[PDB]
């Protein structure tokens, strides 16, 4: 499925993902598209911080869902 990742400023990127993808894999794809290392990324969905190692299906992330990205 495709998802959206929006930074706080408003930088909107579209990601190609599998529901079985871990959050670290999503951060790796974010680095592929935008070029920010994953250790500096913090992903949030539904007001909940996403743990590294958890899958998209753990959080019920579905089609056209929007994550929020916090830099560091």
């Amino acid at each position: 499925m495709q998802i959206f990742v929006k930074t706080l400023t408003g930088k909107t990127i579209t990601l190609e993902v599998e529901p079985s993808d871990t959050i670290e894999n999503v951060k790796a794809k974010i680095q592929d598209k935008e070029g920010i290392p994953p250790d500096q990324q913090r992903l949030i969905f539904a007001g909940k911080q996403l743990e590294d190692g958890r899958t998209l299906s753990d959080y019920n992330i579905q089609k056209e869902s929007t994550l929020h990205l916090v830099l560091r």
């Binding site: 930074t7 400023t9 408003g10 930088k11």
Partner: protein
């Protein structure tokens, strides 16, 4: 200030929303597009770049 003048300033079409003031573009507004493809109000990006040198969205320097 002349560095601000030497920027991709164009006339008004599309509406969208300027990320700074969070307002829809209308007639009479003049848009300014940065090399980082980000477009803003001329007024807003001018008052921003007067004391900073980064794009408000992706933080690329201008």
């Amino acid at each position: 200030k002349e560095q601000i003048d030497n920027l991709a300033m164009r006339s008004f079409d599309a509406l969208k929303t300027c990320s700074v003031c969070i307002t829809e573009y209308t007639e009479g507004n003049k848009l300014r597009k940065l090399p980082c493809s980000h477009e803003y109000h001329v007024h807003c990006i001018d008052r921003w770049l007067s004391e900073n040198s980064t794009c408000p969205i992706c933080r690329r320097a201008v």
